Design a protein around this ligand. Structure first.
Ligand code: SF4
Ligand code: F3S
Ligand SMILES: [Zn+2]
Length: 103
Protein backbone atom coordinates (compact mmCIF):
# COMPACT_ATOMS: atom_id res chain seq x y z
CA UNK A 1 0.00 0.00 0.00
CA UNK A 2 2.82 2.50 0.71
CA UNK A 3 4.59 4.18 -2.21
CA UNK A 4 7.91 2.37 -2.57
CA UNK A 5 9.38 5.53 -4.07
CA UNK A 6 8.36 7.98 -1.33
CA UNK A 7 11.99 8.68 -0.44
CA UNK A 8 12.49 10.37 -3.84
CA UNK A 9 8.90 11.42 -4.72
CA UNK A 10 7.77 13.22 -1.56
CA UNK A 11 9.43 16.31 -0.07
CA UNK A 12 10.86 16.06 3.44
CA UNK A 13 8.71 18.50 5.40
CA UNK A 14 10.03 17.95 8.91
CA UNK A 15 11.68 15.75 11.51
CA UNK A 16 10.08 13.65 14.28
CA UNK A 17 11.92 12.01 17.19
CA UNK A 18 15.14 11.58 15.18
CA UNK A 19 13.51 10.54 11.91
CA UNK A 20 12.38 12.59 8.92
CA UNK A 21 8.77 13.14 7.96
CA UNK A 22 7.75 12.95 4.30
CA UNK A 23 5.02 15.28 3.14
CA UNK A 24 2.52 16.48 2.51
CA UNK A 25 1.18 16.70 6.04
CA UNK A 26 -2.09 18.47 6.84
CA UNK A 27 -3.04 17.68 10.43
CA UNK A 28 -4.91 16.16 11.76
CA UNK A 29 -6.25 14.24 8.77
CA UNK A 30 -3.10 13.95 6.66
CA UNK A 31 0.11 13.03 8.48
CA UNK A 32 2.35 11.65 5.76
CA UNK A 33 5.11 9.05 6.04
CA UNK A 34 7.49 8.77 8.97
CA UNK A 35 10.99 7.31 8.70
CA UNK A 36 13.62 6.56 6.07
CA UNK A 37 15.23 3.22 6.85
CA UNK A 38 11.85 2.00 8.05
CA UNK A 39 8.99 3.95 6.49
CA UNK A 40 5.44 3.93 7.82
CA UNK A 41 2.60 5.68 5.99
CA UNK A 42 0.59 7.23 8.81
CA UNK A 43 -2.25 7.87 6.39
CA UNK A 44 -2.58 4.14 5.72
CA UNK A 45 -1.74 2.64 9.12
CA UNK A 46 -4.90 1.51 10.91
CA UNK A 47 -3.16 0.69 14.21
CA UNK A 48 -3.28 -3.07 13.70
CA UNK A 49 -0.17 -3.52 15.84
CA UNK A 50 1.27 -6.57 14.09
CA UNK A 51 4.42 -4.78 13.05
CA UNK A 52 5.15 -3.74 16.62
CA UNK A 53 4.43 -7.23 17.89
CA UNK A 54 6.64 -8.64 15.14
CA UNK A 55 9.73 -6.44 15.27
CA UNK A 56 12.51 -8.28 17.10
CA UNK A 57 14.44 -5.08 17.76
CA UNK A 58 11.42 -3.03 18.74
CA UNK A 59 11.78 -0.37 16.02
CA UNK A 60 8.16 0.74 16.44
CA UNK A 61 6.33 2.37 19.34
CA UNK A 62 2.72 3.58 19.63
CA UNK A 63 2.34 7.27 18.81
CA UNK A 64 -0.84 9.25 19.41
CA UNK A 65 -2.47 10.97 16.47
CA UNK A 66 -5.88 12.10 17.73
CA UNK A 67 -8.38 12.98 15.02
CA UNK A 68 -6.69 11.10 12.20
CA UNK A 69 -9.45 9.47 10.14
CA UNK A 70 -7.67 6.11 10.00
CA UNK A 71 -6.65 5.70 13.65
CA UNK A 72 -5.92 7.69 16.83
CA UNK A 73 -2.48 6.16 17.21
CA UNK A 74 0.16 4.67 14.87
CA UNK A 75 3.39 2.70 14.76
CA UNK A 76 6.19 5.26 14.86
CA UNK A 77 9.57 3.96 13.64
CA UNK A 78 11.47 5.83 16.33
CA UNK A 79 14.15 3.14 16.64
CA UNK A 80 14.63 2.61 12.91
CA UNK A 81 18.43 2.74 13.12
CA UNK A 82 18.21 -0.62 14.93
CA UNK A 83 16.46 -2.39 12.04
CA UNK A 84 18.05 -5.67 10.95
CA UNK A 85 15.90 -5.98 7.79
CA UNK A 86 14.15 -9.19 8.80
CA UNK A 87 11.16 -7.79 6.89
CA UNK A 88 8.62 -9.26 9.35
CA UNK A 89 6.84 -5.91 9.77
CA UNK A 90 6.39 -5.44 6.02
CA UNK A 91 4.82 -8.88 5.55
CA UNK A 92 2.28 -8.73 8.42
CA UNK A 93 0.87 -5.23 8.05
CA UNK A 94 -2.74 -5.70 6.95
CA UNK A 95 -2.65 -2.51 4.93
CA UNK A 96 0.93 -2.83 3.64
CA UNK A 97 1.75 0.59 5.08
CA UNK A 98 5.40 -0.17 5.76
CA UNK A 99 8.46 0.02 3.53
CA UNK A 100 11.95 -0.96 4.68
CA UNK A 101 15.13 0.03 2.85
CA UNK A 102 18.73 -0.75 3.77
CA UNK A 103 20.77 2.44 4.12
S1 SF4 B 1 12.47 -5.15 9.17
FE1 SF4 B 1 12.49 -6.48 10.93
S2 SF4 B 1 13.73 -5.25 12.19
FE2 SF4 B 1 13.43 -3.83 10.58
S3 SF4 B 1 11.68 -3.08 11.47
FE3 SF4 B 1 10.76 -4.53 10.27
S4 SF4 B 1 10.56 -6.05 11.83
FE4 SF4 B 1 11.90 -4.62 12.75
S1 F3S C 1 -1.47 -1.01 10.42
FE1 F3S C 1 -0.07 0.29 11.39
S2 F3S C 1 0.50 -0.71 13.18
FE2 F3S C 1 1.75 -1.70 12.09
S3 F3S C 1 0.92 -3.48 11.27
FE3 F3S C 1 0.28 -1.87 9.85
S4 F3S C 1 1.57 -0.26 10.44
ZN1 LIG D 1 7.59 9.78 13.71
Amino acid sequence: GIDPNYRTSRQVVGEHQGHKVYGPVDPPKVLGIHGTIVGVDFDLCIADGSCITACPVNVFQWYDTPGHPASEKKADPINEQACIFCMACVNVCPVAAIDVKPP
